[PDB]
Design an enzyme around this catalytic site. Structure first.
Site, PDB file in Angstrom:
ATOM      1  N   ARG A  76      -7.545  16.009  -1.431  1.00  0.00           N
ATOM      2  CA  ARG A  76      -6.174  16.007  -1.939  1.00  0.00           C
ATOM      3  C   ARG A  76      -6.053  15.546  -3.391  1.00  0.00           C
ATOM      4  O   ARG A  76      -6.774  14.638  -3.796  1.00  0.00           O
ATOM      5  CB  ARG A  76      -5.338  15.074  -1.056  1.00  0.00           C
ATOM      6  CG  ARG A  76      -5.641  15.189   0.435  1.00  0.00           C
ATOM      7  CD  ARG A  76      -4.891  14.141   1.229  1.00  0.00           C
ATOM      8  NE  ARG A  76      -5.327  12.784   0.901  1.00  0.00           N
ATOM      9  CZ  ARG A  76      -4.876  11.685   1.507  1.00  0.00           C
ATOM     10  NH1 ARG A  76      -3.974  11.780   2.478  1.00  0.00           N
ATOM     11  NH2 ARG A  76      -5.329  10.488   1.147  1.00  0.00           N
TER      12      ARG A  76
ATOM     13  N   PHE B 287      -3.236   8.489   6.133  1.00  0.00           N
ATOM     14  CA  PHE B 287      -3.140   7.195   6.819  1.00  0.00           C
ATOM     15  C   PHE B 287      -4.074   7.005   8.021  1.00  0.00           C
ATOM     16  O   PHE B 287      -5.061   7.734   8.203  1.00  0.00           O
ATOM     17  CB  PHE B 287      -1.694   6.937   7.297  1.00  0.00           C
ATOM     18  CG  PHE B 287      -0.667   6.833   6.185  1.00  0.00           C
ATOM     19  CD1 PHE B 287      -0.918   6.076   5.040  1.00  0.00           C
ATOM     20  CD2 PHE B 287       0.581   7.453   6.318  1.00  0.00           C
ATOM     21  CE1 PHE B 287       0.057   5.936   4.048  1.00  0.00           C
ATOM     22  CE2 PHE B 287       1.557   7.319   5.338  1.00  0.00           C
ATOM     23  CZ  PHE B 287       1.294   6.560   4.202  1.00  0.00           C
TER      24      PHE B 287
ATOM     25  N   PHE C 141     -20.962  -3.517   3.888  1.00  0.00           N
ATOM     26  CA  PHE C 141     -20.536  -4.456   2.863  1.00  0.00           C
ATOM     27  C   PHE C 141     -21.437  -5.694   2.759  1.00  0.00           C
ATOM     28  O   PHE C 141     -22.014  -6.133   3.755  1.00  0.00           O
ATOM     29  CB  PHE C 141     -19.091  -4.893   3.133  1.00  0.00           C
ATOM     30  CG  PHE C 141     -18.441  -5.551   1.958  1.00  0.00           C
ATOM     31  CD1 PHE C 141     -18.026  -4.790   0.865  1.00  0.00           C
ATOM     32  CD2 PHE C 141     -18.325  -6.939   1.898  1.00  0.00           C
ATOM     33  CE1 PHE C 141     -17.514  -5.401  -0.274  1.00  0.00           C
ATOM     34  CE2 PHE C 141     -17.815  -7.568   0.763  1.00  0.00           C
ATOM     35  CZ  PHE C 141     -17.409  -6.797  -0.328  1.00  0.00           C
TER      36      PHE C 141
ATOM     37  N   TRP D  50     -21.182   4.382  -0.125  1.00  0.00           N
ATOM     38  CA  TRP D  50     -20.665   3.697  -1.299  1.00  0.00           C
ATOM     39  C   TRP D  50     -21.737   3.361  -2.342  1.00  0.00           C
ATOM     40  O   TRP D  50     -21.544   3.612  -3.529  1.00  0.00           O
ATOM     41  CB  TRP D  50     -19.952   2.402  -0.880  1.00  0.00           C
ATOM     42  CG  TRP D  50     -19.206   1.714  -2.016  1.00  0.00           C
ATOM     43  CD1 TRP D  50     -17.988   2.069  -2.534  1.00  0.00           C
ATOM     44  CD2 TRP D  50     -19.654   0.585  -2.788  1.00  0.00           C
ATOM     45  NE1 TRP D  50     -17.652   1.234  -3.578  1.00  0.00           N
ATOM     46  CE2 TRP D  50     -18.653   0.315  -3.754  1.00  0.00           C
ATOM     47  CE3 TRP D  50     -20.799  -0.225  -2.756  1.00  0.00           C
ATOM     48  CZ2 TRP D  50     -18.765  -0.731  -4.682  1.00  0.00           C
ATOM     49  CZ3 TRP D  50     -20.911  -1.268  -3.682  1.00  0.00           C
ATOM     50  CH2 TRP D  50     -19.897  -1.509  -4.628  1.00  0.00           C
TER      51      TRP D  50
END
Ligand SMILES: [K+]
Lengths: 549, 548, 548
Positions: free
Chosen positions: C90, C297, C377, C403
């Protein structure tokens, strides 16, 4: 036998004044039939005790009529006929209603105060002083900005609107200050109907000119960019305002049809205000007479309540009795019957609508005052009805008031039973709530005890306010529930005695020149609209006599 | 202090009697204020009128005019010699009382009383006009809500709302906001209440049945076709007429010298003729031998208008006229600044005289006598005065020290007024006509009266006239809306300007009266409160007023 | 610095070739951005589609989501093993770039490039929608000016204007002020440009001829009778369609790992389904074996909508689905504050797990596979992770450290995705139907997906529905406009709330699509710049960008 076609013979008010105890120097004539009585009268007669205070109210009102004032006046005239020294204290109607949906008289038939035409119109100029005293503040608020805005007000926070005495929706939401740096600051406001002005509220609750002028300076116009309150005092406006209300602080003397004296003074909303008339016109009535009748807006869950928890609270008044109005028809509506077939007998619906009356009787009981009912008479009502409505009143004295038709004579009965409970059942008056309670605590008592509701619901908006307020000091004031008057709930469709429901307050306002408002539904209707068919489109004074009042 | 002037009044109920008025034809508002009914005139329809003494003045200045006082002193002087006379004046707007302060109801020992009641609610005459003006609007906006049944274009509505306070805020605003249930959004605003047309009509109507008629002629706006709609088209007049049922009655009062004062109505002197009511004076005319009135601004407007306006409709015939003028006033016309008026001067006293002198000329032009008047002042030494004295070589000319010598001061003039209203007869004719072209009408007004050599009209101006005349409102009078501080629009060209020209930017038609032709930005139809409002300084003791 | 990620791109003209695209079916915008024509799809109409891999996620939080990155890493991982695959994403609003700053086009070594061009003008796709939305309005307001020929009631116009900046100022305003020559005064306002319906239609139209059709269905307002008018009723569609003639073409680009990225369109995920365009992906479907998309969302809306919305109309059938979830994200769902996420915790890791766990359930409910994903993470110690690992006892569940490990990181998952999209087959069916009552439709959506035991409607709500259905727009889908940070509207009930209820205050009908039912104050259709705007801090060297 038609209301407006019943404005005949009245004695000069001076004569009425003398006969009450007024001196020539305490009267200001407005024609041979209107007087403004100096607040000195009362000031000199404060050590004399008060007469007997009689509050008249009614059951939850419907579009099927009821008629409060008609009884208020007839009862008086009747008390007068029985030899009693009495007066009637009433509110002054708004100008607007006379052109929108026509203006009816003060009660009617042979139960009304006069001169009519003058009281529905400009009367003694009370509503204009209120209309300008008020509008001057708006003006002064605006000027300050214009002049640099030293107090630092976020215009967008200005709660004190403007006001007029007609019905103009078109004035509801508007934008001001357009034009350029030379025409003020641009902002969104609007107009309410004068009688809804907080200025009209203070009038009806103030002690005298100086207590008035003080409240006027405690009035919150808007807020700073910090939330801090900027008051009318801060704008040094109480001085001028008072001066605009100089002649409006005096009651207006005028009589009934039958010449009983009467006081017309004040008159606010009974949802956004106590809906009672000035305290001063009444406290003066209490010294000049032995019996004083006064009425209060909407049902007994509203005007009644507020009459006791505000008016009587502020003035140390202590009601001696309360007459309650009810009709056979409007009781069968609460019983379920449609407005169309209300004329058709149905003791059932009659008996089920009684629940409306029954609750009010009881409620009026939680205030410690002996109640008396006044079934307002009617052509189609039968005996198999009225009769059931009497035995149905197993609690308080009941009696029919042909006060409308037969002047004071039809209220003779009602007069005799009032004096009756007035003699054997002395009053033990106590406000419904103490001031040292929480705001949501007082709001419950009123809706828990008086509306017969389960509990109360608040909206985020509702909370935030009910706290910017508390933490701001106006937390120990009386609460003025603004709901629909057509029910014991906030749903104008739950007729009769609605059980198992909850009130839902969605916004909360402040009237520092008094106390705490709190609307439920769209009880914000502070500016009525002229019907598509303007009662004014047909009004036309002749070369001598009016037509369509 | 001139407000401390509050003292010794005589029951109005009596005075009315001491003028011959059936008690039943008098409504009170306290012992010292009282409304008189239209039945007085109507019952003395044919009886003899009297002498008219319209007291106009120079051309206003910041030195000190005298439009009012001098009008009363001529009553406390005139009647002070067994003469049946009254005073027909104007009621002051409320608003100004909190803005710049409330002034003497006339000036010194002339000011009509009670002062307060006049400068406030009074007998609530305004509020009636007010509620009548705003109800019309109320019906206008409401109508559209119903279906604009008349196919009206909200953007053409020229009918404003109205309030009697000084509010810049309300001048230009948008209303009808909210949604299909609040009304139609359109632009409007508020004008001061006295600047209402519903006020003019008041001062210029025959009776409570003439009023109910005018109203119905008043234009609210037009349809999406340019088709004029009116209050009549809305069936308001009736209602409207009623809100006025009592204001339509003149107001009786007295002086500090108890002379029968008549204070009823009072509009603007630019958009309006600035004359008091036509019913109060026409009534006054019978109730007495003489009638001391007064019009708006410098004699180039109130006067020129008073004539073409009041007198015209009411067939009056001003058996005389006056015109004040201080000593210091003309010197400024001599270039003398406001801070340079203390020092004596005479070379300016003569040039600045051209001012007073011009009006004198126009006065005559209407076919009526005339007399000079000088507000005596402490710095107006002999030298200065002496010069003025003579210059008035053209007709009567006295000195009236009414301000501080009560009626006594106005003695000198009072005699001369009768003196000339006895020897000098007047044939009244309106300086213009009702058929001339709307332009040729303003024309003759700019020429002789003001002193211009021509009048211009802009693009905007040309269309309006043409629109109006094409509609029919061409055979009406014409109310000049120019500035006043100068015979011309140049609010700076002082004294007697020459060779100039007047340009009429716009033209607003007042159906219940006439044509308003604006020359400058005289659209200040809403004053503004200052940084030091008398409202922030007004308070009322536990007994009575202070700083009023 | 993640913007320093700007480096090594391959001419798009080539990639298009390295996917099989007739040059003549490609318009450029520099060497590294290029619009592909609708003739590609249309010419490969019947060829074989591919596998759908809609990557949704948990329920958003202030800890760090991963809706995007994880979507790309699965491409630099997937294709990184000889697989014909793309990414249908998008386009981000312009406004936000000066408000709160511009972020990675995806995240780390996944972000599509060039970054700048995507977060700015790009290929000027927005401006077309923009000018198409505002031209409609322009015609609306103009029309009324002509005679409201259609008897339209300005107060019912629901068609707002639109700008792609963050302006509180334009939210509620009055226009058409000025007078009979400026237009009609009415109230309106501005919404962000991407929140346009003229944007939704973009993402949900078949072709430039489907678009020209929808438009004409779009409601501007009603007449004074309640009679719905439409753009069609105004003959706009044509014009409108043209302003879009080029935006209707998907946009080609790559990755830092040069994988065929498709970034075309992008609306809101409350008022709108939050899916990228239906033409870009349907085209993508042929141009490759697999297609890695992503919706708006938390999976309770974008997902639930993506299905009922996109797939429905386009007959698609999501051969698979994913759903991210960080470690720290679920702990907050365990009551763990944002400042209390550094410390390891597992008793919360399980309760806050209820979150991820619920969506898993709904995912299945549409009749399609599923797989877990964890944004690795630095503070996500072994202990914490290990617990998460197991809990996912219900279907596939891998760890994707894309990431910081490029496609390498997303390796583990990539295999498992094929692994389950090979063994686990899916039969696609929309969780609801187009005939059920507009309420019963929201119903089934609150029940299973969100987790409520019922849905309420206010006075306002009841009428609208009834109005709509009485008009015919009842057989449409339904786009829940509730908050998202909670399965329910309570933006505070975190984790997996139970026993509650949903209340639908209002209902706005979107003719060119569906029914928008708002639960809270999710009408923030215009963001606001803060006290520290990136605009006050953005400058551009005599060479290039700084603080972008
Ligand atoms: K009153």
């Amino acid at each position: 036998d038609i209301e407006i076609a019943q404005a005949a013979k009245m004695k000069p008010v001076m004569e009425l004044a003398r006969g009450l105890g007024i001196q020539e120097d305490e009267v200001e004539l407005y024609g041979k039939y209107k007087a403004k009585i100096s607040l000195d009268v009362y000031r000199r007669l404060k050590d004399k005790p008060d007469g007997k205070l009689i509050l008249v109210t009614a059951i939850t009102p419907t579009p099927a009529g009821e008629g409060k004032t008609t009884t208020s006046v007839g009862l008086t005239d009747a008390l007068a006929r029985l030899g009693k020294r009495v007066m009637v204290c009433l509110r002054e109607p708004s100008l607007g209603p006379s052109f929108g949906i026509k203006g009816g008289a003060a009660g009617g038939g042979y139960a009304q105060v006069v001169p009519m035409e003058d009281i529905n119109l400009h009367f003694t100029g009370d509503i204009h002083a209120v209309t300008y005293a008020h509008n001057l503040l708006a003006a002064m608020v605006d000027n300050h900005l214009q002049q640099g805005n030293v107090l630092n007000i976020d215009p967008r926070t200005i709660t004190w609107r403007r006001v007029i005495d007609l019905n103009d929706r078109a004035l509801r939401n508007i934008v001001i200050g357009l034009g350029g740096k030379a025409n003020g600051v641009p902002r969104e406001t609007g107009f309410d109907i004068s009688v809804a002005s907080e200025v009209m509220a203070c009038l009806c609750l103030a002690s005298d000119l100086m207590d008035l002028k003080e409240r006027f300076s405690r009035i919150v116009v808007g807020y700073t960019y910090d939330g801090k309150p900027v008051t009318a005092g801060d704008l040094e406006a109480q001085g001028s305002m008072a001066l605009l209300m100089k002649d409006a602080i005096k009651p207006n003397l005028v009589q009934t049809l039958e010449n009983t004296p009467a006081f017309i003074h004040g008159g606010p909303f009974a949802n956004i205000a106590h809906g009672c008339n000035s305290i001063i016109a009444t406290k003066t009535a209490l010294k000049l007479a032995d019996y004083v009748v006064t009425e209060a807006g909407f049902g007994a869950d509203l005007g009644a309540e507020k009459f006791y928890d505000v008016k009587c609270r502020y003035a140390g008044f202590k009601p001696d009795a309360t007459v309650i109005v009810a009709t056979v028809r409007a009781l069968k509506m609460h019983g379920g019957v449609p407005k169309s077939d209300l004329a058709t007998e149905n003791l059932e619906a009659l008996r089920e609508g009684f629940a409306n009356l029954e609750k009010h009787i009881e409620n009026i009981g939680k205030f410690g005052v002996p109640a008396v009912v006044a079934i307002n008479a009617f052509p189609t009502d039968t005996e198999a009805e009225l009769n059931l409505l009497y035995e149905l009143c197993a609690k308080a004295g009941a009696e029919v008031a042909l006060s409308w038709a037969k002047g004071g004579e039809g209220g003779l009965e009602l007069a005799r039973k009032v004096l009756q409970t007035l003699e054997s059942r002395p009053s033990n008056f106590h406000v419904l709530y103490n001031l040292d309670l929480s705001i949501k605590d007082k709001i419950a008592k009123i809706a828990t005890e008086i509306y017969g509701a389960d509990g109360v619901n608040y909206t985020a908006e509702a909370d935030k306010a009910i706290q910017r307020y508390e933490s701001l000091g106006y937390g120990n004031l009386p609460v003025v529930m603004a709901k629909t008057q057509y029910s014991f709930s906030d749903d104008m469709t739950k007729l009769g005695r609605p059980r198992n429901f909850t009130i839902t307050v969605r916004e909360v306002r402040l009237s520092a020149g008094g106390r705490l408002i709190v609307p439920i539904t769209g009880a914000i209707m502070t500016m009525p609209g002229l019907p598509k068919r303007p009662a004014a489109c047909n009004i036309d004074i002749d070369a001598d006599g009016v037509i369509t009042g």
